[PDB]
Amino acid sequence: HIIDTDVHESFASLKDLVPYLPEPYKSWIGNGAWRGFSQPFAYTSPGNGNRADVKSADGSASVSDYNLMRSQLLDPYKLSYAVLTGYFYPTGLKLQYGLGSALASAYNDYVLEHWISKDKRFLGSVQINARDPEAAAREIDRMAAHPQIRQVMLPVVDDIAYGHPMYRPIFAAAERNKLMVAFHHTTFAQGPYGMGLHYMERHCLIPISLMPQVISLIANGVFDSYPNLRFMVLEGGFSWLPHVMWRMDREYRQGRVEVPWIKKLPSQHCRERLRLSTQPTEDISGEDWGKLIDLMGTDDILVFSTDYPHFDFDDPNAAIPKSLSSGTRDKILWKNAADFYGLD
Amino acid sequence: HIIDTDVHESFASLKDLVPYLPEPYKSWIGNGAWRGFSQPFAYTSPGNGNRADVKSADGSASVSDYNLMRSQLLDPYKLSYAVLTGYFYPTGLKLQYGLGSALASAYNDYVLEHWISKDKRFLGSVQINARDPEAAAREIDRMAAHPQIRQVMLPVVDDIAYGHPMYRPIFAAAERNKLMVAFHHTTFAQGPYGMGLHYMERHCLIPISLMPQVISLIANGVFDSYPNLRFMVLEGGFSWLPHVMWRMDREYRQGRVEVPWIKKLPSQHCRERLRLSTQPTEDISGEDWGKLIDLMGTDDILVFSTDYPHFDFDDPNAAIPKSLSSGTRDKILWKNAADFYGLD
Ligand SMILES: [Fe+3]
Ligand SMILES: [Fe+3]
Ligand SMILES: [Fe+3]
Ligand SMILES: [Mg+2]
Ligand SMILES: [Mg+2]
């Protein structure tokens, strides 16, 4: 039993969405008025962000061929489930919201037709344009129909803290439709002072772009006001979570006159309803895993992911220390995710 | 012994700096053309950011009376040394660099005459305007000649990552003058998406404004370029340091080719020359302290501080768990700081 919570599929070409777009957007994209995203840095690994044996058609760090994924990932590792978390994140567009929203819908149509419908091991994400939270809510209502769709994907761009009350229609729609919430960094993710000055630094900063989302959701009452949502943060690490939990607890105890809508200790909200992917490895010893899980106070929090097809892919047979107890190992590799997605 | 690495003294009024200012800044400040900083949020603790029993003359979260510090902190605890870290950080001025630098200089004159020269337990910090690194370097040259001056303060404002090469004259001047480097957050410290929406969330975010300075300094070669410098990050916590060290090590291994100037593993750099204060408390058990020290791989890193006179003052007799070994406790309470400042 293995569930993979982070897999990056994509179209082969941006014009694959033209059949799904209404005019004028259809003509804008068909005639080349916008050519898509191009990450604002050079990858320093061979393979251009992917493993060396995976290329997408448009060059991005993704996979555009289901046959390649099935033959490299799904079948060889005998995955029970693989969560498609996308890669084309229209929330990265900072103007022309009507365009970003039409791209979000068109992308979800494309993935349902050429991915999710091809394999029962897939669990799908609703991609959205979070800059129009009401349109995003309507796309969530649209796509929650399909029983394999299980979460909404909230992309971490440069300028959005998702606990801002502007975004509440998104979480209300997610809850309404029995979908969970997932967070993933974009090519625009940054620290307080930018992405740094080199690729290696930009990549060190990815955890720093994501810890404020946990802090934001809790301080602004997102956990308290949608009790049926669980929240999964992918690819930001987990070794920092003891500190984020203890810190939030201290600030809650000292400052609760200011935040009376928080009705549990932040650490308790997190143990109950926050999940963090294990990928990428920090190359940590087995006894160090056990210590960190102790400090977290539970083994319910970690979910396995490979992050196929990216360069720092986590081999399922080597990422999770086998010295861990069997109950904990089963939780990390599949039970924690299974409970998150309401499976079995 | 006990050495306090974080104590916030200030002037009683900004006009106290007039006697040290040249024209036209002398007249600007004396006549009230600028009235100083005023933090952009309401404190939610009784005490306006301070202990309920300490009030500064200008209303800021600091202490302006040496007699009060001596009888509330220096004498009652038998402090061997106290590091005056300031509070008024002119780097927060984002224009009129000439004025900002004259204020740094004036402030340093004030502190030497009315604070440092009054008590041999004080270690002093050079306050600067980091927006003009060449002027900042001349002020470091000017003040380093006093023996109690032992470090330069690098304030963490909203928009400065100190690893950017523009800042190298500051590190060059520190190393040349045999001073160390300390970082402290300002009232302008923030995360990637601002300082949040509540005071409690702004306070949660402080460690997020400080972790990127460790990442910036290492990735951009500050550690390797200035091997005789030691770096202290204050008030950011320390439970996050294992993640930051592990992450940076991982990024280094997979991306050396981009950063050949980094001659040691980031974790080794940190174990040897990065220090972190223990304040404020996260309320964690002695057992858990020992596990975190395990995860950093040394007990050389932590330095005690009270952060007098702030609301989350750490009492020297209760902040450091007693189940830790006496060696570790001695290192934390004074020996790590003594070696950092070149004392005893
Ligand atoms: Fe991923
Ligand atoms: Fe990735
Ligand atoms: Fe403080
Ligand atoms: Mg000196
Ligand atoms: Mg305290």
Author numbering:
A (entry chain G), B (entry chain A): 2 to 345
Can you quote the paper on this entry?
The genomic neighborhoods of candidate AROs stemming from Litorilinea aerophila (A0A540VG95, referred to as SfbO), Afipia carboxidovorans (B6JH23), Cytobacillus firmus (W7L2Y2), and Geobacillus strain Y412MC10 (D3EI84) intimate disparate physiological functions. Each of these proteins was fused to an N-terminal His6 tag, recombinantly expressed in Escherichia coli, and purified as soluble protein preparations. Aerobic samples of these Fe2-metalated proteins were found to exhibit moderately intense UV/vis features centered near ∼350 nm, consistent with charge transfer bands classically associated with diferric FeIII–OHx–FeIII motifs. These features were diminished upon anaerobic addition of ∼1.2 equiv of sodium dithionite (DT) and returned following reexposure of these samples to air.
Representatives of the latter enzyme class—collectively defined here as “amidohydrolase-related dinuclear oxygenases” (AROs)—include PtmU313 and AibH2,9,15 which employ dinuclear cofactors with different metal identities.
